[PDB]
UniProtKB/Swiss-Prot annotation, chain A:
Heterotetramer; the NMDAR subunits are modular and harbor tiered domains that function in concert to regulate opening and closing of the cation-selective ion channel pore. Forms heterotetrameric channels composed of two GluN1/zeta subunits (GRIN1), and two identical GluN2/epsilon subunits (GRIN2A, GRIN2B, GRIN2C or GRIN2D) or GluN3 subunits (GRIN3A or GRIN3B) (in vitro). Can also form heterotetrameric channels that contain at least two GluN1 subunits and at least two different GluN2 subunits (or a combination of one GluN2 and one GluN3 subunits) (in vitro). Component of N-methyl-D-aspartate (NMDA) receptors (NMDARs) that function as heterotetrameric, ligand-gated cation channels with high calcium permeability and voltage-dependent block by Mg(2+). NMDARs participate in synaptic plasticity for learning and memory formation by contributing to the long-term potentiation (LTP). Channel activation requires binding of the neurotransmitter L-glutamate to the GluN2 subunit, glycine or D-serine binding to the GluN1 subunit, plus membrane depolarization to eliminate channel inhibition by Mg(2+). It comes from the Eukaryota. NMDA is probably regulated by C-terminal phosphorylation of an isoform of GRIN1 by PKC. Its phosphorylated state is influenced by the formation of the NMDAR-PPP2CB complex and the NMDAR channel activity. Belongs to the glutamate-gated ion channel (TC 1.A.10.1) family. NR1/GRIN1 subfamily. It is linked to Neurodevelopmental disorder with or without hyperkinetic movements and seizures, autosomal dominant: An autosomal dominant neurodevelopmental disorder characterized by severe intellectual disability and developmental delay, absent speech, muscular hypotonia, dyskinesia, and hyperkinetic movements. Cortical blindness, cerebral atrophy, and seizures are present in some patients. Neurodevelopmental disorder with or without hyperkinetic movements and seizures, autosomal recessive: An autosomal recessive neurodevelopmental disorder characterized by severe intellectual disability and psychomotor developmental delay, involuntary and stereotypic movements, spasticity, and inability to walk without support. Intractable seizures manifest in some patients. It comes from Homo sapiens (Human). This is Glutamate receptor ionotropic, NMDA 1.
Swiss-Prot record, chain B:
The chain crosses the membrane at residues 10-30. Changing residue 12 to V: In FESD; pathogenic; gain-of-function characterized by enhanced agonist potency, reduced sensitivity to endogenous negative inhibitors, prolonged synaptic-like response time course, increased single-channel mean open time and increased channel open probability. It is found in: Cell projection, Dendritic spine; Cell membrane; Synapse; Postsynaptic cell membrane. The chain holds residues 793 to 837 of 1464 of the full protein. The gene is GRIN2A. Changing residue 13 to E: In FESD; likely pathogenic. Component of N-methyl-D-aspartate (NMDA) receptors (NMDARs) that function as heterotetrameric, ligand-gated cation channels with high calcium permeability and voltage-dependent block by Mg(2+). NMDARs participate in synaptic plasticity for learning and memory formation by contributing to the slow phase of excitatory postsynaptic current, long-term synaptic potentiation, and learning. It comes from the Eukaryota. Belongs to the glutamate-gated ion channel (TC 1.A.10.1) family. NR2A/GRIN2A subfamily. This is Glutamate receptor ionotropic, NMDA 2A. It is linked to Epilepsy, focal, with speech disorder and with or without impaired intellectual development: An autosomal dominant, highly variable neurologic disorder. Features range from severe early-onset seizures associated with delayed psychomotor development, persistent speech difficulties, and intellectual disability to a more benign entity characterized by childhood onset of mild or asymptomatic seizures associated with transient speech difficulties followed by remission of seizures in adolescence and normal psychomotor development. Heterotetramer. Forms heterotetrameric channels composed of two GluN1/zeta subunits (GRIN1), and two identical GluN2/epsilon subunits (GRIN2A, GRIN2B, GRIN2C or GRIN2D) or GluN3 subunits (GRIN3A or GRIN3B) (in vitro). Can also form heterotetrameric channels that contain at least two GluN1 subunits and at least two different GluN2 subunits (or a combination of one GluN2 and one GluN3 subunits) (in vitro). In vivo, the subunit composition may depend on the expression levels of the different subunits. Found in a complex with GRIN1, GRIN3A and PPP2CB. Found in a complex with GRIN1 and GRIN3B. Contains an N-terminal domain, a ligand-binding domain and a transmembrane domain. Agonist binding to the extracellular ligand-binding domains triggers channel gating.
Length: 50, 32
């Protein structure tokens, strides 16, 4: 039972699904992420409004 | 979709059961 409880759920943090991950919807200081600079990634972020 | 979204204990019972069975068998031996 202990081994099954250990191996059923992976202790490592789940991988990011993509641009619609739950943590991306409500950013928090516990999970900080940013692009480099005002480059095309910043332009895409500004163009997106959702 | 856009808004409004986002996101043992039986071991003691078993050991008590086996202890009770052992006690019942001991009582049977004593009365025999």
């Amino acid at each position: 039972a202990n081994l099954a409880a250990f191996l059923v759920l992976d202790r490592p943090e789940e991988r990011i699904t993509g641009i619609n991950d739950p943590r991306l919807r409500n950013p928090s200081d516990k999970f900080i992420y940013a692009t480099v600079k005002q480059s095309s990634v910043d332009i895409y972020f500004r163009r997106q409004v959702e | 979709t856009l808004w409004l979204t986002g996101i043992d204990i039986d071991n003691m019972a078993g050991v008590f059961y086996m202890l009770a069975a052992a006690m019942a068998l001991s009582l049977i031996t004593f009365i025999w």
